[PDB]
Ligand binder design. Structure first.
Ligand code: ZN
Ligand code: ZN
Ligand code: ZN
Ligand code: ZN
Ligand code: ZN
Ligand code: ZN
Ligand code: ZN
Ligand code: ZN
Lengths: 66, 66, 66, 66
């Protein structure tokens, strides 16, 4: 459907976010995992904004419609 | 390569695990996110064992080789 | 008050849980952090059950009333 | 001892951080839990810097010496 949850993950260098986990890979890189919930369209747009940022690599969005 | 990190995510109902996050979706379902690190082969085998379990659905493994 | 959030943390070896994080300290010990929300009385009882378990050490409950 | 792990938790509005979890309480407040590891002195200083920030409330540091 259009409503559900999603997992956005990416490596670095809003009422949509349920929880976000930051895990350090090394001195320069942080692995970030964000659990999102709401309208899948708003979820995609959130991921869009994140992936558009410099320093953000390997962005992946796993959608989980209800 | 063969060594790096990985993000295994799945909905429910080892020295490989760096951190695991459990988030409740509702009364019956828990979204689980596991951050793994080590040999990508051991990582895949870990995911294999998890996905083979009854009650585990929508399993996804995102690999991040160094 | 009686309703709010709480952080239960402990070292190892329900609709109350919002999210739980497991972090490995070493081969034998896992640091677990549980974010709880609901009636502070139910929260305390949840922590009670966890701390009563063998293998669970250094249990600490930080309450955050609304 | 002086080396070990620690859990720093606080409500909002480095090679020391192992993992950090952000959980939304509501529109304005985010509950943040940081798992730290290293010299307990460096850990305390990290917590000091965080708690000194405006908007940061209910800061608590649970130390876990090895
Ligand atoms: Zn981060
Ligand atoms: Zn980082
Ligand atoms: Zn779970
Ligand atoms: Zn669950
Ligand atoms: Zn655990
Ligand atoms: Zn463990
Ligand atoms: Zn936060
Ligand atoms: Zn926040």
């Amino acid at each position: 459907g259009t409503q559900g949850f999603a997992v956005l993950s990416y490596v670095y260098e809003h009422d949509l976010s349920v929880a976000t986990l930051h895990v350090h890979i090394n001195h320069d890189d942080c692995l970030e995992i964000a659990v999102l919930k709401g309208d899948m369209g708003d979820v995609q747009h959130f991921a869009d904004d994140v992936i558009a940022q410099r320093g953000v690599r390997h962005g992946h969005l796993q959608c989980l419609p209800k």
